[PDB]
Amino acid sequence: SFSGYLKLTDNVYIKNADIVEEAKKVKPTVVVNAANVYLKHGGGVAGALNKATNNAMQVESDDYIATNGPLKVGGSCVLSGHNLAKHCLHVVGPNVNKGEDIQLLKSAYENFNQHEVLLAPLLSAGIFGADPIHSLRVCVDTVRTNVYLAVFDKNLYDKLVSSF
Numbered sequence: 001s002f003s004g005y006l007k008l009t010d011n012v013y014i015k016n017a018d019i020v021e022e023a024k025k026v027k028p029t030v031v032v033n034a035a036n037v038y039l040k041h042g043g044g045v046a047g048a049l050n051k052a053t054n055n056a057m058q059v060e061s062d063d064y065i066a067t068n069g070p071l072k073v074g075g076s077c078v079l080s081g082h083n084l085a086k087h088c089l090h091v092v093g094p095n096v097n098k099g100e101d102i103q104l105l106k107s108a109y110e111n112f113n114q115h116e117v118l119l120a121p122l123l124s125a126g127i128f129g130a131d132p133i134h135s136l137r138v139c140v141d142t143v144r145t146n147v148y149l150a151v152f153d154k155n156l157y158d159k160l161v162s163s164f
């Protein structure tokens with residue numbers, strides 16, 4: 001039920017959209033969160049996704065962390081998608097603004113391959129400091145499953161498409 005996506009490759013599609021609004025209309029099987037190792041959903045996609053669940057995502061995330069400890073950079077966990085999706089795949093991409101190794105971005109994208117279809121943001125772009133053009137490149141070169149990328153910024157969306 002994804003509509004208005006531009007085809008980039010056989011399995012990668014892209015749209016200028018807010019991933020929260022896209023998730024509510026579609027209610028996909030998997031929505032990807034741009035998470036940190038602590039699952040503290042304060043800003044960016046994480047804060048926007050959590051706010052849409054009335055904080056139910058954060059309460060569930062704190063219980064997960066209390067039992068399992070923090071995730072690894074490049075790692076992921078599957079939790080409830082609440083009112084946005086069946087599941088939320090919380091993926092930790094490297095935060096370049098915190099000195100984390102950009103090489104871990106491919107490892108972060110590999111988590112996508114465990115799911116047939118996903119609605120996702122561009123990993124490590126935004127407040128994480130990675131180059132969004134590099135992030136799209138790693139995505140197309142790593143994900144083999146069907147991924148629908150939601151890019152919030154119109155001017156970034158245009159730049160991404162015109163340079164692909």
Ligand SMILES: CNC(=O)c1cc2c(N[C@H](c3ccc4c(c3)OCCO4)C(C)C)ncnc2[nH]1
Binds near residue numbers: 019123124125151156
């Ligand atoms: C109220 N809604 C929002 O604040 C919102 C932001 C947002 C988003 N932003 C992108 C991004 C990529 C990757 C991230 C990220 C942000 O946040 C931290 C780390 O990972 C780029 C284009 C800025 N993409 C899709 N839906 C989004 N919704």
